[PDB]
Amino acid sequence: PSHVPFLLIGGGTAAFAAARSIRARDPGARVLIVSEDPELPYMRPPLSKELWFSDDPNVTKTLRFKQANGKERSIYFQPPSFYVSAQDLPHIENGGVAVLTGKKVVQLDVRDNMVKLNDGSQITYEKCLIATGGTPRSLSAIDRAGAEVKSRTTLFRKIGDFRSLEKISREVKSITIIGGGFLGSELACALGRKARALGTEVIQLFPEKGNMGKILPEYLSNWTMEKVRREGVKVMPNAIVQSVGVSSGKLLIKLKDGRKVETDHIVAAVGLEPNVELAKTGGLEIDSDFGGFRVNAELQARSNIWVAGDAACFYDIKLGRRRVEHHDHAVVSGRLAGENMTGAAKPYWHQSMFWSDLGPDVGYEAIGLVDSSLPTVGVFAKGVIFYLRVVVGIVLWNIFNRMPIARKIIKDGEQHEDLNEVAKLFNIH
Amino acid sequence: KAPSHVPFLLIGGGTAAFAAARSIRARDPGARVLIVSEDPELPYMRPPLSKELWFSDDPNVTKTLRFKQANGKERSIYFQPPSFYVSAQDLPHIENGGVAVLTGKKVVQLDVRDNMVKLNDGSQITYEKCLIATGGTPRSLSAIDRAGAEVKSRTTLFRKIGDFRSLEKISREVKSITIIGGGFLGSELACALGRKARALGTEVIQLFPEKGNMGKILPEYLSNWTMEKVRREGVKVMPNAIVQSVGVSSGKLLIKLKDGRKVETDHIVAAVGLEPNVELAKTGGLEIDSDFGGFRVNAELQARSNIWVAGDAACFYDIKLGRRRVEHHDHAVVSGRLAGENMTGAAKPYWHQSMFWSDLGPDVGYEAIGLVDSSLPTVGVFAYGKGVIFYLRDKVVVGIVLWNIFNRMPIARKIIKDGEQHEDLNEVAKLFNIHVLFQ
Ligand SMILES: Cc1cc2nc3c(=O)[nH]c(=O)nc-3n(C[C@H](O)[C@H](O)[C@H](O)COP(=O)(O)OP(=O)(O)OC[C@H]3O[C@@H](n4cnc5c(N)ncnc54)[C@H](O)[C@@H]3O)c2cc1C
Ligand SMILES: Cc1cc2nc3c(=O)[nH]c(=O)nc-3n(C[C@H](O)[C@H](O)[C@H](O)COP(=O)(O)OP(=O)(O)OC[C@H]3O[C@@H](n4cnc5c(N)ncnc54)[C@H](O)[C@@H]3O)c2cc1C
Ligand SMILES: Nc1ccnc2ccccc12
Numbered sequence: 009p010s011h012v013p014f015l016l017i018g019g020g021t022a023a024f025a026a027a028r029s030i031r032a033r034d035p036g037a038r039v040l041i042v043s044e045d046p047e048l049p050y051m052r053p054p055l056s057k058e059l060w061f062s063d064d065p066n067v068t069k070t071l072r073f074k075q076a077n078g079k080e081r082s083i084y085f086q087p088p089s090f091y092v093s094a095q096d097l098p099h100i101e102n103g104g105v106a107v108l109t110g111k112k113v114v115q116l117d118v119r120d121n122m123v124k125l126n127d128g129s130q131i132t133y134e135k136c137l138i139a140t141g142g143t144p145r146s147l148s149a150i151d152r153a154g155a156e157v158k159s160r161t162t163l164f165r166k167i168g169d170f171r172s173l174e175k176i177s178r179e180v181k182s183i184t185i186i187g188g189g190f191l192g193s194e195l196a197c198a199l200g201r202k203a204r205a206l207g208t209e210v211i212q213l214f215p216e217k218g219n220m221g222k223i224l225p226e227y228l229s230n231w232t233m234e235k236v237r238r239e240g241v242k243v244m245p246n247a248i249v250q251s252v253g254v255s256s257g258k259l260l261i262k263l264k265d266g267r268k269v270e271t272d273h274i275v276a277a278v279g280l281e282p283n284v285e286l287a288k289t290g291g292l293e294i295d296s297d298f299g300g301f302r303v304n305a306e307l308q309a310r311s312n313i314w315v316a317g318d319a320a321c322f323y324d325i326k327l328g329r330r331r332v333e334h335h336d337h338a339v340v341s342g343r344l345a346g347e348n349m350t351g352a353a354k355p356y357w358h359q360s361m362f363w364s365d366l367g368p369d370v371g372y373e374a375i376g377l378v379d380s381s382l383p384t385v386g387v388f389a390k391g392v393i394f395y396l397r398v399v400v401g402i403v404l405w406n407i408f409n410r411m412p413i414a415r416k417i418i419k420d421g422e423q424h425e426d427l428n429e430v431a432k433l434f435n436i437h
Numbered sequence: 438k439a440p441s442h443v444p445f446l447l448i449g450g451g452t453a454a455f456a457a458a459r460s461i462r463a464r465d466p467g468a469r470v471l472i473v474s475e476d477p478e479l480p481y482m483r484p485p486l487s488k489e490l491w492f493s494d495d496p497n498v499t500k501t502l503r504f505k506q507a508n509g510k511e512r513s514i515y516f517q518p519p520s521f522y523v524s525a526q527d528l529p530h531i532e533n534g535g536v537a538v539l540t541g542k543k544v545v546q547l548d549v550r551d552n553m554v555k556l557n558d559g560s561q562i563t564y565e566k567c568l569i570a571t572g573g574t575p576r577s578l579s580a581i582d583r584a585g586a587e588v589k590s591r592t593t594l595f596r597k598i599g600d601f602r603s604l605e606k607i608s609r610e611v612k613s614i615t616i617i618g619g620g621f622l623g624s625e626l627a628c629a630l631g632r633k634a635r636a637l638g639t640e641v642i643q644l645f646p647e648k649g650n651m652g653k654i655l656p657e658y659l660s661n662w663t664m665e666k667v668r669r670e671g672v673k674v675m676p677n678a679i680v681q682s683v684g685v686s687s688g689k690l691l692i693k694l695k696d697g698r699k700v701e702t703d704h705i706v707a708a709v710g711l712e713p714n715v716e717l718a719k720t721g722g723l724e725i726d727s728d729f730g731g732f733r734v735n736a737e738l739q740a741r742s743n744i745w746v747a748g749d750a751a752c753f754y755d756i757k758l759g760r761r762r763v764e765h766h767d768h769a770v771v772s773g774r775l776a777g778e779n780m781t782g783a784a785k786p787y788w789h790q791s792m793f794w795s796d797l798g799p800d801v802g803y804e805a806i807g808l809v810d811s812s813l814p815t816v817g818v819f820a821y822g823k824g825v826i827f828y829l830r831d832k833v834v835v836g837i838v839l840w841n842i843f844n845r846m847p848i849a850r851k852i853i854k855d856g857e858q859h860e861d862l863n864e865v866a867k868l869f870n871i872h873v874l875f876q
């Protein structure tokens with residue numbers, strides 16, 4: 009279309025949450041999502057968890073999974089029928105939400121409230137959301153290596169990466185994951201389960217002393233490393249890749265400490281870069297400290313431009329400036345951006361949580377500023393870890409259905425005299 | 438006195454606030470604008486307080502607060518006479534609204550959620566659109582803070598009309614005044630007191646830690662040249678001076694410098710920078726900028742949905758020059774005018790760069806625009822009686838200083854805007870009628 013009232017750039021979690029939010033407050037709204045991916049809006053978390061533990065061998069085609077509640081669900085937020093076509097968006101009665109797949113916004117003219125797509129077409133808007141997310145980072149060693157190495161290295165992010173790596177796990181005998189964070193540790197447990205039935209190998213190396221060394225205290229990270237290892241993974245901590253090359257057709261990873269790792273495929277899970285290409289042409293400020301588009305407490309960048317999701321560096325009136333890369337944050341902030349695009353003028357207030365599952369025996373939820381650099385106070389019986397600066401972050405270890413309590417402790421900002429007494433709020437005695 | 442609700446609420450009664458009120462009224466005929474000013478004066482301009490009012494031929498200038506401009510026409514220091522304003526009590530009723538000023542009242546609390554403010558007297562005012570134009574407070578030296586009350590009683594922080602009247606009376610009473618600070622304010626007051634001191638035979642000292650006046654603004658060779666011009670105005674300039682302590686010796690102030698020198702004087706004027714007034718950020722939940730200070734606002738000077746910031750207290754995003762905060766008179770006008778337009782739906786970014794100027798006597802006057810910083814690499818082209826100094830970043834001119842060259846600011850504004858990578862800056866100097874120095 010040549011003009012649309014609401015234009016959401018990017019077709020991910022934040023964009024979909026905004027469309028549902030705009031339509032809820034403006035029942036007649038006409039929302040156009042522009043997505044460079046060929047897929048309709050889908051959620052990522054199942055790509056590294058539930059889709060790898062499915063009993064259906066057609067999961068690669070169906071993209072369905074059983075949730076914690078047991079009910080089966082699709083990875084997509086809505087079926088295609090719930091959307092309208094971009095051709096009909098300006099005419100359909102009571103508007104709707106359209107998605108323009110396979111199209112990338114390459115230029116943003118803030119002055120004329122216009123965008124230019126990769127195919128030359130131009131679209132003007134009245135309100136606009138930037139929800140571009142981010143691109144996976146790559147290691148300098150894989151960049152400085154040959155093309156044979158880059159071709160045998162996976163950057164896990166999209167549905168295509170899940171299908172590509174699932175096929176690889178059924179073809180080669182050894183996969184090495186580089187990265188000890190959420191993505192690396194979850195993929196290790198997933199490939200470990202698959203590797204147990206085939207007798208194959210799954211290696212995970214990272215520079216920290218343990219899994220989630222940057223998130224969890226050392227004692228809990230070390231326990232996590234054992235949980236991952238018991239899933240069939242060969243975990244190699246304190247590993248800094250110096251170089252990577254192909255030797256006799258086999259990948260050879262040379263670590264700075266003299267160790268060498270022979271493997272068939274590499275998976276790089278070493279962080280995320282916010283997609284801020286459009287800041288240049290748009291004259292939009294980016295944040296030098298946290299990266300991403302710099303927006304205020306209401307996720308607003310300019311008069312008619314908001315930013316949500318992984319790419320949004322926002323001002324938390326209580327926690328300070330920050331940028332979050334969590335699924336529930338894209339939902340909360342995407343929903344908030346949609347409301348503010350319809351006049352709500354509301355600041356980011358309801359904190360978003362994140363979670364991770366490392367096998368069937370390890371699952372935790374977290375909220376707020378969770379950083380191993382902050383001083384921690386862990387209370388275990390299952391347990392809870394408090395992060396301090398007043399409680400600013402909480403990690404619930406195998407404790408579920410208690411997130412509102414954690415969200416309330418951080419909100420109230422009390423100076424607790426005994427956190428062991430606070431642990432009773434999570435049923436720890 | 439103050440109404441319970443006003444459409445437009447401007448916090449602070451200075452240059453940015455007045456420029457916004459005039460801008461709001463020009464774009465929104467009939468608008469109702471309430472300025473809240475803790476000062477007792479109606480909005481007035483500051484530059485004359487350190488310049489034209491000290492060179493006036495009228496001996497009643499201290500009372501009239503009028504001065505002759507460069508064009509020669511006489512005018513008052515106030516932006517408008519009282520007749521231009523309406524009273525806050527009548528602001529909600531007068532036909533086609535107006536602009537009211539609530540003097541002697543300070544906004545002490547800001548509730549962004551409820552679009553409400555609380556004044557120091559407990560009264561509460563709700564608004565639809567709000568401008569924070571609080572400016573800044575002069576800084577004080579730690580040596581003057583650690584000194585006795587006798588020292589604090591004879592040390593002036595120059596900012597308001599009261600400080601001009603207080604220091605003008607002092608210049609006619611004591612024999613030695615010492616200015617601490619080598620920037621614009623210190624150097625302009627030194628030239629002013631120097632003129633007065635020549636007719637009275639008194640003394641004017643100016644000490645600062647830099648090697649010369651405006652050492653942070655001008656290259657070293659031009660700062661040194663300026664220091665000599667200031668000295669020839671009757672000033673005893675002491676560069677490379679770091680105040681260690683201050684005390685009273687035989688009833689006279691005694692300034693002990695870290696390098697062993699001592700200065701005996703009767704009165705001190707501290708011109709050592711400005712602190713943005715960001716008191717209201719706490720209650721308002723408004724972000725302040727850790728690098729440049731002030732309220733952090735975007736290219737449209739906006740902080741939240743219905744709150745803008747302009748003037749000295751506004752750290753904004755310059756789409757061309759990057760994030761910064763400016764403390765210039767013309768910037769308060771430009772940014773105040775820009776905030777006013779955006780408070781009426783304009784949604785316009787800071788684009789037209791503001792200029793600043795300074796006069797150091799009758800034989801030294803310069804204009805400047807953009808990022809003027811002595812730390813940046815400079816390229817000066819002179820004919821130092823006349824010339825232009827270019828400030829560079831990424832092989833591009835980001836700031837210009839016109840030295841005794843006037844009526845050519847639009848040309849400087851265009852060079853910075855176009856962002857060309859000039860091969861020969863001497864050819865660019867011809868655009869300023871100059872027919873070469875690196876620092
Ligand atoms: C495998 C995986 C597992 C995860 N598991 C969890 C989990 O268990 N718990 C958790 O809390 N979080 C998890 N996350 C993180 C969560 O998925 C992210 O926080 C979330 O996807 C962020 O949504 P977003 O809307 O900001 O961006 P995205 O989901 O990245 O969507 C952005 C979309 O915009 C498109 N785009 C970018 N630039 C342009 C442009 N110029 N024009 C058009 N389109 C453009 C991108 O292609 C992408 O399609 C996981 C992420 C991954 C990849
Ligand atoms: C003596 C002097 C000479 C100058 N000469 C020049 C010059 O030649 N060229 C140049 O470019 N610049 C010059 N400047 C700088 C220029 O004056 C400033 O940039 C300008 O005054 C800034 O305007 P402003 O509106 O941001 O703030 P201000 O003029 O400082 O106005 C702020 C007002 O708000 C009031 N206020 C603050 N907080 C509150 C509150 N909570 N509630 C109510 N009221 C409040 C303050 O009391 C003050 O009255 C000079 C400054 C001075 C002091
Ligand atoms: N489990 C997760 C939590 C937060 N961010 C993530 C990013 C990528 C993969 C997994 C996660």
Ligand SMILES: Nc1ccnc2ccccc12
Nearest residue numbers: 621622764765793794795
């Ligand atoms: N001439 C000036 C320019 C900018 N700031 C100033 C502050 C005080 C005095 C004079 C000036």
